[PDB]
Amino acid sequence: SGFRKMAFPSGKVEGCMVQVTCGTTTLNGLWLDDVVYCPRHVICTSEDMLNPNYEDLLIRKSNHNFLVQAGNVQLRVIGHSMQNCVLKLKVDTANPKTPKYKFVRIQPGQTFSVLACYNGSPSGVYQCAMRPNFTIKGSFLNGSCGSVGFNIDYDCVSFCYMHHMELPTGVHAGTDLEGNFYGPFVDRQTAQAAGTDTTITVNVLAWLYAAVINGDRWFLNRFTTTLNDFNLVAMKYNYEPLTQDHVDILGPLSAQTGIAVLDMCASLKELLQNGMNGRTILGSALLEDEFTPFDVVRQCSGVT
Amino acid sequence: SGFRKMAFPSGKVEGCMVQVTCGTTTLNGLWLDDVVYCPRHVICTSEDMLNPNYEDLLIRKSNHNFLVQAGNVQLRVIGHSMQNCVLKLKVDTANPKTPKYKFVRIQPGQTFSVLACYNGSPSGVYQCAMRPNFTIKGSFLNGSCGSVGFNIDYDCVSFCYMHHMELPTGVHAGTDLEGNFYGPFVDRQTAQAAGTDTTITVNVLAWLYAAVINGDRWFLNRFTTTLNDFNLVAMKYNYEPLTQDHVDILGPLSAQTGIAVLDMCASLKELLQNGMNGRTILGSALLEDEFTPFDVVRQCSGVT
Ligand SMILES: O=C(Cc1cccc(Cl)c1)Nc1cncc2cnccc12
Numbered sequence: 001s002g003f004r005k006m007a008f009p010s011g012k013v014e015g016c017m018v019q020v021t022c023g024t025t026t027l028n029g030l031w032l033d034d035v036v037y038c039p040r041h042v043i044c045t046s047e048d049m050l051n052p053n054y055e056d057l058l059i060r061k062s063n064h065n066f067l068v069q070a071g072n073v074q075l076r077v078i079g080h081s082m083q084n085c086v087l088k089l090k091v092d093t094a095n096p097k098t099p100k101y102k103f104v105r106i107q108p109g110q111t112f113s114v115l116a117c118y119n120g121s122p123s124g125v126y127q128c129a130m131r132p133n134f135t136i137k138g139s140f141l142n143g144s145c146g147s148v149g150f151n152i153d154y155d156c157v158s159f160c161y162m163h164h165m166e167l168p169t170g171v172h173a174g175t176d177l178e179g180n181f182y183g184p185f186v187d188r189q190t191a192q193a194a195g196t197d198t199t200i201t202v203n204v205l206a207w208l209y210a211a212v213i214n215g216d217r218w219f220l221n222r223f224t225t226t227l228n229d230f231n232l233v234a235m236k237y238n239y240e241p242l243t244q245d246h247v248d249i250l251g252p253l254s255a256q257t258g259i260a261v262l263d264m265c266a267s268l269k270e271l272l273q274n275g276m277n278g279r280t281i282l283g284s285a286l287l288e289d290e291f292t293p294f295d296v297v298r299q300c301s302g303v304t
Numbered sequence: 305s306g307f308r309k310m311a312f313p314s315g316k317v318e319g320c321m322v323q324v325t326c327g328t329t330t331l332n333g334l335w336l337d338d339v340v341y342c343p344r345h346v347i348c349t350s351e352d353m354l355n356p357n358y359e360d361l362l363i364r365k366s367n368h369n370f371l372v373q374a375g376n377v378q379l380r381v382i383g384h385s386m387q388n389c390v391l392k393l394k395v396d397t398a399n400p401k402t403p404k405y406k407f408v409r410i411q412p413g414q415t416f417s418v419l420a421c422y423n424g425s426p427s428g429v430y431q432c433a434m435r436p437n438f439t440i441k442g443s444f445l446n447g448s449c450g451s452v453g454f455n456i457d458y459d460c461v462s463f464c465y466m467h468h469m470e471l472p473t474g475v476h477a478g479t480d481l482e483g484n485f486y487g488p489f490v491d492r493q494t495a496q497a498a499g500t501d502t503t504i505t506v507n508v509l510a511w512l513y514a515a516v517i518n519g520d521r522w523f524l525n526r527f528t529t530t531l532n533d534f535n536l537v538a539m540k541y542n543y544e545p546l547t548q549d550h551v552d553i554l555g556p557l558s559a560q561t562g563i564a565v566l567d568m569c570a571s572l573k574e575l576l577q578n579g580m581n582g583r584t585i586l587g588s589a590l591l592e593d594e595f596t597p598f599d600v601v602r603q604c605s606g607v608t
């Protein structure tokens with residue numbers, strides 16, 4: 001029992017982290033096979049970050065201008081290319097610690113672990129979610145760019161995020177490993193609108209099932225609702241609309257607890273309309289939305 | 305910016321996890337140098353867990369009865385001994401992945417990362433604290449015994465916890481790496497009193513400084529207090545008494561924000577007396593106590 005914001009073990013990702021320096025800018029890179037992936041803003045100075053022409057800036061750079069260090073040893077750069085907002089530096093050596101991996105573009109509401117890094121060295125690991133507004137609420141300081149987000153299935157690391165930017169609001173924006181930003185963000189030092197951040201309804205329901213599984217049941221009520229009645233409440237409280245696809249994914253948790261998904265929706269409706277009245281659920285005084293149904297099952301079953 | 309419940313990167317610990325089986329019981333072990341450390345209840349069946357005489361039970365066991373598997377390869381056991389509540393299995397091979405390490409017994413209020421494991425395989429990592437009542441609020445299922453808690457300083461892993469037991473209340477009890485339980489717990493299937501769990505006052509103040517550093521300042525007030533006035537409030541709200549030792553450790557955070565420690569205490573006093581009024585601090589609707597002053601500085605500075 002017990003329920004925690006749990007990250008995947010980060011070892012497989014630690015073995016891929018390297019330091020990339022170009023000119024006077026240093027950030028993190030991801031070494032997989034003979035390629036190092038990093039944010040393309042590594043070629044920028046603070047001056048051209050205002051309005052950068054990345055193609056024109058990259059023309060002034062050669063393979064020898066990209067310094068890639070793995071621990072204390074230097075990697076020889078034999079190629080460089082730009083794919084969207086990432087640079088791919090071909091090195092002459094394959095990373096001996098390259099795990100089985102895939103590049104995946106996650107959907108909003110999905111969760112992932114982040115290995116925050118500075119100077120190619122890992123500092124910590126935390127769990128977070130891609131927000132409906134395509135930002136992440138991370139914890140990142142200057143030098144953290146190039147830190148990656150990932151999920152792990154048995155021995156395979158699915159890289160889903162690369163950190164690039166912090167918005168003036170203190171929230172984070174980044175790309176998938178093909179260099180495509182999540183959301184409307186551009187890699188420019190210009191104020192950018194994040195957008196309304198709604199609550200991930202299916203994840204709150206998954207966490208409510210996690211609460212029942214671990215003993216917290218005070219919020220269970222004698223009511224039920226329908227998808228349309230529930231969604232009227234969800235709209236009012238800036239929660240994502242719940243669909244039959246969401247109900248279907250909550251099936252295993254509904255079967256584990258014997259609580260029909262619409263009955264759990266009625267519990268959520270009452271919690272939204274009445275608040276928690278000073279009570280807690282899984283050590284939290286608010287409704288948690290950064291655990292997916294898969295996360296709850298994985299944590300409550302022990303998948304390694 | 306951003307503040308997260310961040311764990312240390314777990315790679316150094318993953319390389320030490322092994323599976324230990326004795327009879328029909330399988331749990332995790334920690335392989336460092338040529339020794340495998342595991343909870344001594346690995347020698348028990350469910351029947352003798354009611355009242356085990358570990359010395360008499362260990363007499364029926366030989367080196368060949370302890371099956372130690374590292375990944376898919378078997379370790380040869382050449383020695384076994386019991387130290388308090390842990391078994392030390394001497395193996396014929398030193399772990400090639402043994403990091404620089406120390407065994408430390410942490411104080412209540414201190415935090416650490418946990419690498420939850422099942423069958424010698426890591427499933428996830430989370431941050432937690434040794435509670436004032438010497439329990440930890442972990443997330444552990446059957447088979448998680450032998451999973452360890454740790455801190456990392458540059459390249460050195462300080463192992464501080466080994467998981468042994470879940471109390472009927474769903475909270476967790478374990479030992480240091482010398483096999484001494486934290487708190488009054490015994491390794492027996494008997495109901496055991498955890499004790500009153502108070503809030504780690506110095507950690508809540510550290511998290512309030514973390515909130516100011518990251519922009520959340522609504523709770524800052526025009527008041528101050530004294531240690532004795534504050535402690536009257538702390539006693540009333542089941543918070544640990546604050547001492548000058550606690551004020552001294554909050555020095556760097558007080559210097560970073562320009563907020564005197566007793567002024568921050570007055571903010572905490574008002575939050576305790578008035579609640580949060582439906583507001584949040586660092587994405588939380590309650591006062592967080594599982595970040596030490598060291599954790600806040602480390603996260604807000606980027607120590608790798
Ligand atoms: O945001 C940037 C630099 C930047 C500026 C404009 C566009 C782009 Cl793509 C990147 N770096 C940081 C990332 N995360 C967190 C930080 C915290 N403090 C300072 C800097 C941080």
Ligand SMILES: O=C(Cc1cccc(Cl)c1)Nc1cncc2cnccc12
Nearest residue numbers: 001345444445446468469470491492493
């Ligand atoms: O508590 C025990 C077994 C046990 C019983 C009495 C004494 C001692 Cl030292 C150990 N194992 C578990 C640990 N953590 C979490 C669990 C969750 N579910 C089942 C079992 C768990």
